[PDB]
Amino acid sequence: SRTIGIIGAPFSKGQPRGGVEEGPTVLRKAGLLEKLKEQECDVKDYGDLPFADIPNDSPFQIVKNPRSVGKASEQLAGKVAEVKKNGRISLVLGGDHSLAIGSISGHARVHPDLGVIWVDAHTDINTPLTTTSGNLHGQPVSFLLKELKGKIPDVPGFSWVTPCISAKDIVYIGLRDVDPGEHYILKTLGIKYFSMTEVDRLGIGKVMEETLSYLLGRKKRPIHLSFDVDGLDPSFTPATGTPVVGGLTYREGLYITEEIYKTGLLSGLDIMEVNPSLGKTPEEVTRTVNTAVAITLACFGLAREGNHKPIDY
Amino acid sequence: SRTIGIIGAPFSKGQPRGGVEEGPTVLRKAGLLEKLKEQECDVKDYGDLPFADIPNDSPFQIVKNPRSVGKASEQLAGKVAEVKKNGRISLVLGGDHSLAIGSISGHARVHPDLGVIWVDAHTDINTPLTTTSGNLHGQPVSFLLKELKGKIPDVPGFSWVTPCISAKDIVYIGLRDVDPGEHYILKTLGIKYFSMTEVDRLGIGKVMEETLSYLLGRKKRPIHLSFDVDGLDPSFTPATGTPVVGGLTYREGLYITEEIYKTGLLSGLDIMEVNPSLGKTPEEVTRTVNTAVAITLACFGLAREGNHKPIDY
Amino acid sequence: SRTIGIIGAPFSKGQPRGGVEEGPTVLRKAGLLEKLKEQECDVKDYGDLPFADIPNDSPFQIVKNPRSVGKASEQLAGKVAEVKKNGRISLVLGGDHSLAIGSISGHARVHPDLGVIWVDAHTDINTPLTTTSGNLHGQPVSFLLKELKGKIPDVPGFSWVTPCISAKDIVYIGLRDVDPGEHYILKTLGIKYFSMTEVDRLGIGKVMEETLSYLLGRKKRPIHLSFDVDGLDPSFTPATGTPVVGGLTYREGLYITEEIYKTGLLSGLDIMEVNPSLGKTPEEVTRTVNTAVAITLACFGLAREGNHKPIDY
Ligand SMILES: N[C@@H](CCCC[B-](O)(O)O)C(=O)O
Ligand SMILES: N[C@@H](CCCC[B-](O)(O)O)C(=O)O
Ligand SMILES: N[C@@H](CCCC[B-](O)(O)O)C(=O)O
Ligand SMILES: [Mn+2]
Ligand SMILES: [Mn+2]
Ligand SMILES: [Mn+2]
Ligand SMILES: [Mn+2]
Ligand SMILES: [Mn+2]
Ligand SMILES: [Mn+2]
Ligand SMILES: [Zn+2]
Ligand SMILES: [Zn+2]
Ligand SMILES: [Zn+2]
């Protein structure tokens, strides 16, 4: 049985648009807990993390809201480590992707051997010195990579941080809008990725075959899936802050997660960037939330071929 | 030359929404017969089967409109067997999918060795005892499987029925909304299927390669294609009663049928569930009918690469 | 470095709808030159070819506006040969596809060994005698094939033409609406093609693998990509004269061009059939132009995985 630990993370200061803090809210009213229970899932809600409001938080060079972001992740890391200590798969219903710093950090405290699968249209690996926007939701991966220690300056709010994963312990899926410096980092650190080009060339089937073999190569290990809603095409998840055309389809999104589930190794999940206030209509919001939910349910057993209990129907 | 036998089947009592009885009507006004003739097709219209209105037809346990459904299929089976006896491929322009009982039954009377390819978002294999909706359009396959005889109670209107095919003589393509008991039946009877997950993993090319090799393995045999319009994504065929997101694309729909045609073994075809009254706009109806037609034409020779007659152009 | 030679070709008399002459205009205001420069591209604008208005130009049999079309291509051929003589990749921002006659002709004058990749929903290989519409945008390939010399009557405005390529030097990608005589020509001349059926069967990855191996088989050679905007599905490029459902996706469009770029052999490019006046709304025009631009940028280095300069970021 897959036991989950729900963690509402209503945070938005990793990027400019505030509606993203409502993600936990709309996903819960969409019936996420109920539907997960409608499956043979053991669900425990740790609630929406009451985030600290930091009024005095000026930029660090170009970096915006560092103390607010650094604190929210520090907080989140503690909780995540708590649910992991409780033998449950952490399900972070987030706001912006900057929270990945706290989510993966807390996860690694309990399972330092985790591997990460990052589904996103972006690499989110800009450093405080390579970022041109200054938004932290596009920098989480740089704070977590060991090889990048010595290239990240002491940013206010992140002294508690300590790189927990190596460049070879992560795989990207869905990339289509990578900045120049981010690309240089990819090639230089030798990070394994499958941009939309490789998805097109190989097919999501082979893509998943290779991703799992790449991470679970020398040994089985806990899997951390950080899912950025904008990894999927804007025709499926339009209500998000940084949409990019030519994305992963609904089917590929479910295929990705269905394959992850089947490994039996999922231990950490991030459902991020759903911003209901960014839908052009009421149904664009509904379409985004529903897709987000569907992807979540797939991570915990829901299969398109069907499901049945150990009884004689 | 591919000789066809058109059979209008204006029936809806297999499910709650009545607009589906108009399928034959809108498909004929869409120019189906004309377009089939525009190809080297020998077309004979057997007309719209005048269906018997059965006012006294209370539920059997949970099963709704059994006598009306059982009669419509009994009628349809007779006709289908008639066109098959006339050396023509039966083309059933239907209403709801419950009619498959009569279509496949009549087909098998003349060609007891047929194989069936079922394109649907659903398995339609619920038994009168496993169904939770009581709608017969989601139960046709259970009445046709020999291995399930002894699990189907005597339902009013179906005494004429006799299971004609084995679980290994059928292949599903497109599945994405299967009930628990239906899943148990799949696994227990060992039915071969390609849910949307296998389509995503392998590609429609391999999917068709395997389906045809699976059915025409030990020997060539007549092929029965029961096509449920909801097997395709609702972005292509929105005007249908039970739409499910993440469906087969327009291209995959045509690929499926193009490959079937090329075998030269198609002998029975079902174009079901088009319900014009369920389109949200006039063009959603137009989009559904046009796709339905396109799929039909592909089954009888129309190829995307082009077509030409045995003359020197 | 990839040096480009921009050639505006505001022409429409190859087909009935005139808005296509605005293609160069809207593509330039979309920032095409600027964006190409934003890449390490050496860009030179040769301007919009002022096309000769030919008031006296009655049909030749069924062929409409032959002298206007024949002249526009004769003009274009001269320019194209000029930029090629200047060591630059010719970028023809066109109107209708009839201009391919002049584009490929001028290209071949300088590189008689070129290979052509034709992305289109159509083969555009009708002869003045096989065409049923009389529109020249659906006949350009017939004027360029050597094997067809003796089957093309002396059409006013094309005496300057001389077939420059053989049937085995061209590959089609995207076909889904081919006329009977066009099909006969395909099979008879043995032209290599990948209709939407082969794309569906093999995947765009294998399709590109085979196309490039087919053309650059016995030796590397200059590549001419004639891209008809209607090769992509109308959901991506709706503002075009002859749209056909079930087309190439946005992703496949970019994959095609990304692979072409990587060969380092692109020497001639045609971005044709964008007709802003045919968009049902302001955004359908915007969607078409943006896709057109994106495809253009991919042909010159823009990659979805990212790009970075030879410096230490
Ligand atoms: N690369 C851009 C956009 C990053 C997008 C962040 B994400 O993936 O969390 O939405 C930036 O650094 O500002
Ligand atoms: N499984 C559901 C829905 C079946 C849908 C039937 B069909 O495929 O014909 O639309 C039921 O038994 O009611
Ligand atoms: N085959 C049709 C349509 C050709 C379409 C031309 B094209 O590809 O340039 O849009 C004709 O000959 O008129
Ligand atoms: Mn993103
Ligand atoms: Mn992200
Ligand atoms: Mn169905
Ligand atoms: Mn059905
Ligand atoms: Mn075309
Ligand atoms: Mn064309
Ligand atoms: Zn973000
Ligand atoms: Zn139905
Ligand atoms: Zn055209």
Q: What is the 3-state secondary structure (H, E, C) of B44-103?
A: EEEEECCCCCCCCCCCECCECCHHHHHHHHHHHHHHHHHHHHCCCEEEEECCCHHHHHHH
Are C27 and C297 in contact, with CB atoms under 8 Å apart?
no
Are C188 and C210 in contact, with CB atoms under 8 Å apart?
no
Are C211 and C194 in contact, with CB atoms under 8 Å apart?
yes
Residue A93 has, within 13 A of its CA and on its CB side, a CA count of: 30
Whole-angstrom distance, CA of residue A270 vs CA of residue A217 = 23
Q: Domains in chain B, start-ordered, CATH in brackets?
A: 1-313 (3.40.800.10)
Residue owning the nearest CA to atom 10 of ligand 2? B242
Mutating to test ligand 2, I would choose from B125, B130, B242, B271 the residue with most ligand atoms within 8 A of its C-beta, which is B242
Whole-angstrom distance, CA of residue A159 vs CA of residue A276 = 32
Residue C292: count of CB within 10 angstroms of its CB:
28
Residue A225's nearest CA partner among A212, A240, A244, A235 is A212
Chain A interface includes B129 (CB < 8 A): no
Residue owning the nearest CA to atom 13 of ligand 3? C133
C215 phi, psi to nearest 5 deg: -85, -40
Determination approach: X-ray
Are B93 and B28 in contact, with CB atoms under 8 Å apart?
yes
Residue A221: count of CB within 10 angstroms of its CB:
17
> Exposed/middle/buried for C44, CB within 10 Å: 0-12, 13-18, 19+?
middle
CA distance C294 to chain B (A): 23
Taking the centre of ligand 12 as the mean of its atom positions, its distance from the CA of residue C99, in whole angstroms, is 10
Whole-angstrom distance, CA of residue B136 vs CA of residue B260 = 27
Q: Which of A48, A57, A122, A169 is catalytic?
A: A122
Catalytic site residue A177? no
Nearest to B181 among A204, A205, A313 (CB): A313
C284 token code pair: 């359908």
Whole-angstrom distance, CA of residue A181 vs CA of residue C306 = 9
Which residue numbers of C are catalytic? Answer: 97, 120, 122, 124, 137, 228, 230, 273
| Cβ-based contacts of B197 with chain A (< 8 Å) | 254-255, 258, 303-305
A44 token code pair: 């425990």
Q: Which of A120, A233, A259, A270 is catalytic?
A: A120
B307 token code pair: 């077509």
Q: What angle is formed at CA C24 by the lines to CA C20 and CA C26, rounded to 5 degrees?
A: 85
C61 token code pair: 């049999």
3-state secondary structure of A267: strand
Residue A104: count of CB within 10 angstroms of its CB:
29
Cα-atom radius of gyration of chain A, to the nearest Å? Answer: 18
A257 token code pair: 């997660």
Are B215 and B115 in contact, with CB atoms under 8 Å apart?
yes
CA distance C39 to chain A (A): 11
Minimum CA–CA partner of B201 in chain A: A205
Are B104 and B113 in contact, with CB atoms under 8 Å apart?
no
Chain C interface includes B306 (CB < 8 A): yes
Whole-angstrom distance, CA of residue A253 vs CA of residue A244 = 15
C122 is in an annotated binding site: yes
Whole-angstrom distance, CA of residue A262 vs CA of residue B201 = 14
Taking the centre of ligand 3 as the mean of its atom positions, its distance from the CA of residue C9, in whole angstroms, is 19
CA distance A249 to chain C (A): 11
B123 token code pair: 């398995």
Whole-angstrom distance, CA of residue C186 vs CA of residue B148 = 51
Distance of CA A269 to the CA centre of its chain: 7
Whole-angstrom distance, CA of residue C220 vs CA of residue C216 = 5
Does residue B130 have its Cβ closer than 6 Å to ligand 2?
no
Distance of CA C152 to the CA centre of its chain: 21
| Cβ-based contacts of A306 with chain B (< 8 Å) | 123, 175, 178-180, 182-183, 186, 195
Chain C interface includes B258 (CB < 8 A): yes
Q: B115 CB contacts (<8 Å, ≥6 apart)?
A: B169, B170, B171, B215, B216, B221, B222, B223, B224
How far from B196 is each of A173, B122, B141, CA to CA, in Å?
Answer: 20, 11, 19
How far from A127 is each of A117, A230, C11, CA to CA, in Å?
Answer: 20, 21, 49
Q: For residue C106, what is the enclosing H or E element?
A: helix C100-110
* Ligand having the closest approach to the CA of B230: 6
Cα-atom radius of gyration of chain B, to the nearest Å? Answer: 18
Cβ–Cβ below 8 Å for A200 and C252: yes
C152: left (phi over 0), alpha (psi -120 to 50) or beta: beta
Whole-angstrom distance, CA of residue A37 vs CA of residue A31 = 10
B124: left (phi over 0), alpha (psi -120 to 50) or beta: left
Are A121 and A244 in contact, with CB atoms under 8 Å apart?
yes
As beta bridge partners, residue A272 has: A228
Cβ–Cβ below 8 Å for B303 and C197: yes
B103 is in an annotated binding site: no
CA distance A138 to chain C (A): 15
A124 is in an annotated binding site: yes
Whole-angstrom distance, CA of residue A174 vs CA of residue A176 = 7
**Cβ-count burial A137-151 (b if 16+ within 10 Å, e if not):** bbbbbbbbbebbeee
Residue owning the nearest CA to atom 3 of ligand 2? B138
A122 is in an annotated binding site: yes
Q: C206 CB contacts (<8 Å, ≥6 apart)?
A: none
Are C98 and C131 in contact, with CB atoms under 8 Å apart?
no
Nearest to B313 among C123, C180, C245 (CB): C180
Whole-angstrom distance, CA of residue C153 vs CA of residue C173 = 28
Sequence letter at residue A289: V
Chain B interface includes A255 (CB < 8 A): yes
Residue owning the nearest CA to atom 10 of ligand 1? A242
Minimum CA–CA partner of C175 in chain B: B305
Whole-angstrom distance, CA of residue B181 vs CA of residue B313 = 57
Are B2 and B41 in contact, with CB atoms under 8 Å apart?
yes
Are A86 and A25 in contact, with CB atoms under 8 Å apart?
no
C208 token code pair: 């590109």
Distance of CA A137 to the CA centre of its chain: 11
> Helix-strand-coil percent breakdown of chain C, rounded to 5?
40, 15, 40
Cβ–Cβ below 8 Å for C123 and B306: yes
Residue B235's nearest CA partner among C282, A120, A287 is A287
Give DSSP secondary structure letters for C270-295. EEE---GGG-SSHHHHHHHHHHHHHH
Whole-angstrom distance, CA of residue C153 vs CA of residue C161 = 12
Taking the centre of ligand 8 as the mean of its atom positions, its distance from the CA of residue C250, in whole angstroms, is 16
Are A227 and A119 in contact, with CB atoms under 8 Å apart?
yes
Taking the centre of ligand 3 as the mean of its atom positions, its distance from the CA of residue C168, in whole angstroms, is 21
As beta bridge partners, residue B225 has: B117, B269
| Cβ-based contacts of A283 with chain B (< 8 Å) | none
Are C143 and C158 in contact, with CB atoms under 8 Å apart?
yes
Whole-angstrom distance, CA of residue C295 vs CA of residue C251 = 10
Residue owning the nearest CA to atom 6 of ligand 1? A138
Q: What angle is formed at CA A26 by the lines to CA A22 and CA A30, rounded to 5 degrees?
A: 165
Site of tokens 């290994």: B168
| Cβ-based contacts of C130 with chain B (< 8 Å) | 313
Neighbours, chain A (3 or more CB pairs < 8 A): B, C
Which residue numbers of B are catalytic? Answer: 97, 120, 122, 124, 137, 228, 230, 273
Give DSSP secondary structure letters for chain B. -EEEEEEE----TTSS-GGGGGHHHHHHHTTHHHHHHTTTEEEEEEEE--PPP-S----BTTB-SHHHHHHHHHHHHHHHHHHHHTT-EEEEE-SSGGGHHHHHHHHHHH-TT-EEEEE-SS-----TTT-SS--GGG-HHHHHBGGGTTSS---TT-TT----B-GGGEEEES-----HHHHHHHHHHT-EEE-HHHHHHH-HHHHHHHHHHHHSSSS---EEEEEEGGGB-TTT--SSSS--SS-B-HHHHHHHHHHHHHHT-EEEEEEE---GGG-SSHHHHHHHHHHHHHHHHHHTT--TT----SS--
Q: What is the largest CA-CA distance in chain B?
A: 65
Are A174 and A199 in contact, with CB atoms under 8 Å apart?
yes
Whole-angstrom distance, CA of residue A144 vs CA of residue A106 = 11
Are A301 and A39 in contact, with CB atoms under 8 Å apart?
yes
Whole-angstrom distance, CA of residue B286 vs CA of residue C124 = 28
Residue B240's nearest CA partner among B1, B89, B17, B6 is B17
CA distance A293 to chain C (A): 25
Q: For residue A185, what is the enclosing H or E element?
A: helix A180-189
* Ligand having the closest approach to the CA of C125: 3
Residue B125's nearest CA partner among B183, B196, B198 is B183
User: Can you list the positions of beta strands (E) in chain C?
Assistant: 2-8, 41-48, 89-93, 115-119, 170-173, 192-194, 223-228, 266-272
Residue owning the nearest CA to atom 1 of ligand 2? B138
Q: For residue A227, what is the enclosing H or E element?
A: strand A223-228
Nearest to A306 among B130, B178, B198 (CB): B178
| Residues B27/B28/B31/B37 CA torsion (nearest 10 deg) | 110
Residue B248's nearest CA partner among B230, B264, B227, B263 is B230
Q: A100 CB contacts (<8 Å, ≥6 apart)?
A: A124, A140, A141, A144, A226, A270, A272
C5 is in an annotated binding site: no
Q: A183 CB contacts (<8 Å, ≥6 apart)?
A: C305, C306, C307, C308
End-to-end CA distance of chain A: 21
Whole-angstrom distance, CA of residue B265 vs CA of residue B81 = 17
Residue A175: count of CB within 10 angstroms of its CB:
27
> Exposed/middle/buried for B120, CB within 10 Å: 0-12, 13-18, 19+?
buried
As beta bridge partners, residue C48 has: C8
